[PDB]
Symmetry: C2
Subunit: 319 residues, 2 copies
């Protein structure tokens, strides 16, 4: 269905989904909802070349955590590294659904991605996944040599709830005083457990990610209102003092996205706190433009991916 101004291929994609019909995602079991993303991502021929992928299980902060290490192919030596936190509304997502996005970031940056297999919701609730995400980030900083990376040159990155996770891991690293981070890449992040922004109102339906989906995602994550008010759930609620000293950020938002305004608002809060921020709204785009494989060849998406990889590279250089 979409709106005037939606990029042409994206609009055609939305119309194709509308014609395909199907139950609202939030009316499905977590298992069936996961299968929607799995099936849709698998339905598209995509370039996954130029990477080498290796699983690694680590012992960190009291639990076993599974990683996927994604390295630029045919490259020798220690490389700088970014943690990658996947989206999917906490309920959906995993490594293979996100592999093309991760691949594009790795190939475009020359840096190694460390995907963290955090526990999904509702199997776990806040703050289980963010504690895993932080534990893995500290692990990479300390033990990077074991997986062929320079852990002292370390960024965090993610899409959607993964952008939430990246932002929150940066906050947790500030709180803990470790590890040092070069950069945070937030691709259309969730930043606030509230649903009254102008973008939430304007794009409630018809633009892939719906308000109904967002409320369901948040409900599966946690129904504890006190938890939702914590900065580690809703980082937009942080004060300037709480944000001071965070690493430089690139925040990409999508024009036609309920989460657009809270993402841009978080960028403004970082800027007001003296954090270096580049905040770029990709016009014509819907939420998860960098994830969805049917959109991966849209020229604006390719440009967004080129930028994301380049900014990772710029911030992960030697000295």
């Amino acid at each position: 269905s979409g709106s005037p101004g939606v990029e042409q291929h994206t609009q055609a994609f939305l119309e194709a989904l509308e014609q395909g019909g199907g139950k609202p995602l939030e009316q499905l079991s977590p298992k069936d909802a996961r299968a929607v993303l799995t099936g849709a991502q698998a339905s598209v021929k995509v370039d996954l070349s130029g990477i080498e992928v290796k699983e690694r299980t680590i012992q960190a902060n009291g639990q076993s955590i599974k990683l996927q290490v994604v390295r630029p192919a045919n490259v020798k030596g220690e490389l700088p590294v970014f943690m990658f936190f996947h989206g999917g509304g906490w309920v959906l997502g995993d490594f293979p659904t996100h592999q093309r996005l991760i691949r594009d970031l790795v190939v475009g940056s020359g840096a190694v991605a460390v995907y963290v297999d955090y526990t999904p919701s509702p199997e776990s609730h806040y703050p289980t996944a963010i504690n895993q995400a932080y534990a893995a980030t500290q692990w990479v900083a300390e033990h990077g040599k074991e997986i062929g990376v320079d852990g002292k040159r370390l960024a965090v990155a993610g899409n959607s709830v993964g952008g939430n996770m990246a932002a929150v891991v940066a906050l947790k690293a500030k709180e803990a005083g470790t590890p040092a981070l070069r950069f945070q890449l937030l691709l259309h992040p969730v930043t606030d457990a509230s649903f009254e922004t102008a973008s939430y109102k304007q794009f409630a339906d018809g633009h892939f990610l719906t308000t109904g989906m967002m409320k369901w995602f948040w409900d599966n994550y946690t129904t504890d209102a006190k938890a939702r008010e914590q900065i580690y759930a809703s980082p937009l609620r942080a004060s300037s003092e709480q944000l001071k000293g965070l690493p430089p950020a690139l925040v990409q938002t999508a024009e036609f996205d309920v989460l657009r305004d809270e993402g841009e608002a978080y960028a403004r809060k970082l800027n007001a706190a003296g954090v270096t921020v580049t905040s770029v709204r990709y016009n014509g785009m819907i939420h998860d433009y960098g994830l969805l494989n049917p959109l991966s060849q849209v020229p604006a998406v390719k440009a967004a991916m080129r930028q994301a990889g380049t900014e990772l590279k710029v911030h992960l250089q030697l000295e």
Copy 2:
């Protein structure tokens, strides 16, 4: 003065200008206004390395036109090429005021820039400069070998009224059936001789480029209302049919810019006409963020420049 959300260094810049005082630009003679930009650009140490600059005067469509050819240094062979049309509101601007911006685009793309020294206003009026701009573009396509470029791989680029000029040259090339263009790079372009968009209302003052300046710029360009209604002055007025077949575009706009809305509106019109467009709003930025030397080290500006160079490069490749 600025607004909540203006990027921190940009805000400090605006405040410094406010404290410096001085007459409104539009109350100055063209000569004195030109000197404001010349002096301000010269007051900042900037990196101009990595280029070789050579002047060339050409005979094209009945007149002598001066070019500055800006080539990546230490590179052999034919290179692809982009025309560069400078901003300055038609009254101001020239090569040296714009040299750092041009340099960044050349170094970041690996392509040669051809700066066109169009006749300023009010010394000339519409359509003198755009006819010169087009003549030079056709010349480069035909005679590129003479200046070390592959004229068959040709883009147009410009900031502000230079973005207007690039967009209009692309339209003139469609009208003439020549030359073929790979790409149009529009950095915060002027697209419409009207002053009633929401951004014009919101950012009328306090954000460097004022509504008063824009009206003065347009008045110096042409006071002919019929001329202003032509698509070669106000390309936003073009129909979908008139825009069909134009080359792929990157349109960067600035959040805090009176011209923001008409730039984004032009991107939407291109998209509606089936033209490939990437439209990106750089949040926190003011107009001419890529031109103004005091802002050239602002991290978001560096990111915008990296993107602009990269997108030129991507679109100017072989085959």
